[PDB]
Design an enzyme around this catalytic site. Sequence first.
Site, PDB file in Angstrom:
ATOM      1  N   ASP A 108     -39.267 -32.682  23.814  1.00  0.00           N
ATOM      2  CA  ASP A 108     -39.181 -31.283  24.319  1.00  0.00           C
ATOM      3  C   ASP A 108     -38.144 -30.510  23.500  1.00  0.00           C
ATOM      4  OD1 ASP A 108     -39.827 -29.127  25.936  1.00  0.00           O
ATOM      5  OD2 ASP A 108     -38.565 -29.760  27.639  1.00  0.00           O
ATOM      6  N   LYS A 142     -37.031 -27.239  21.809  1.00  0.00           N
ATOM      7  CA  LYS A 142     -37.369 -25.810  21.997  1.00  0.00           C
ATOM      8  C   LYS A 142     -36.092 -24.993  22.021  1.00  0.00           C
ATOM      9  CE  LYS A 142     -37.775 -26.549  27.001  1.00  0.00           C
ATOM     10  NZ  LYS A 142     -38.238 -25.943  28.259  1.00  0.00           N
ATOM     11  N   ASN A 190     -33.182 -25.369  24.613  1.00  0.00           N
ATOM     12  CA  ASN A 190     -32.337 -26.592  24.517  1.00  0.00           C
ATOM     13  C   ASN A 190     -31.400 -26.511  23.319  1.00  0.00           C
ATOM     14  OD1 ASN A 190     -34.076 -27.362  26.496  1.00  0.00           O
ATOM     15  ND2 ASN A 190     -35.242 -28.759  25.189  1.00  0.00           N
TER      16      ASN A 190
END
Length: 386
Positions: free
Chosen positions: A188, A190, A193
Amino acid sequence: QRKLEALIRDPRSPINVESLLDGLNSLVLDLDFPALRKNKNIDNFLNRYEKIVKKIRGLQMKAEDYDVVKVIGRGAFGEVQLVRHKASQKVYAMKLLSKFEMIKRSDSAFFWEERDIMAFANSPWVVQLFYAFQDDRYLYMVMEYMPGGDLVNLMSNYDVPEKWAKFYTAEVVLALDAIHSMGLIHRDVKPDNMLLDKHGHLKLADFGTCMKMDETGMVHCDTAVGTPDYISPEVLKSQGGDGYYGRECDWWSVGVFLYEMLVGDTPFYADSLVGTYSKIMDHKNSLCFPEDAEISKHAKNLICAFLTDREVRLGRNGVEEIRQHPFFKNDQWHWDNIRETAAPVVPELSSDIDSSNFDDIEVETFPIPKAFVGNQLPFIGFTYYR
Ligand SMILES: Cc1[nH]ncc1-c1cc2nc([C@@H]3CC4CCN3CC4)[nH]c(=O)c2s1
């Protein structure tokens, strides 16, 4: 039996004293109820230990130890607070995770890899954990404050030129290479983050989706995890089963990032989830760039080099392919020294609690059990001190 002594002494080890004290505390919290105490065994135990267990909980780091300066973001499992520790007067970011919501969603494992990475990564690319502690209702992670905000907020406050994207992309690439070097694939990746420190430089921050690799650097995952725009075809397919893939699933996520940063929308955007999912599966057809939003052939080449099948994706043979791509050639920085050059956006901070690069924001405990439910068992071993 000296072999044993080592396991206990290691803060990395799941049977260190803090994790053994979590063990005793969580047992006493999950047994001490009128109903269960009708059991002699359980009453005998709680009589012996209950009193000293309270005395210990007394000394344990509490929520009240911190002043909540303001809320800088809210997750589904609860919020992230800018806080000042009362005693030390030091400023931190504190993430709260509701035990009630994690239990209720059957989702009480994601945080282990996140805690491990932030506590022990010791990388200038990984946001740092000072304290994990819990109470009956909440998990707490006390991290260093990243006052520059996230990139989702940067990209929406600036037209980002290639010169900027080169920098931000390179820093993400080095960060993931750091994460990969710790035997983890992130999944994840992105802009939400990706956080900016006081000097405008990048740090990965959310790790709930991270997974240990094989001895062979692969994983067997049969769950399609991470956020839909940025998810890789191989991870989406792996919900159908026989999931078997390596870290090249993160270089996809970078390509998507780079696309969004230069174009201005995600390349597989759709009105629904299942719409975005359909587009990603069909990426050979579905990927194309608007007949306007102008992109140097180098930038466009890197994006398409990233947004391919796993077998031919840039970074399959290793991270050096990436590093010596034409797009990254620049006068400002080399890969050895990027994180001590001047960032494209150095934030204007007024004080140690300036949260102006964060947008503003603005009741659900457990029921008394019939018999043993073990609601605190999933969080034995969380507690961590630096
Ligand atoms: C350490 C630090 N310093 N300055 C900011 C931060 C962090 C902020 C943050 N925010 C979130 C939130 C919760 C959900 C909703 C949106 N974000 C993703 C999931 N998650 C995180 O791990 C972190 S770390």
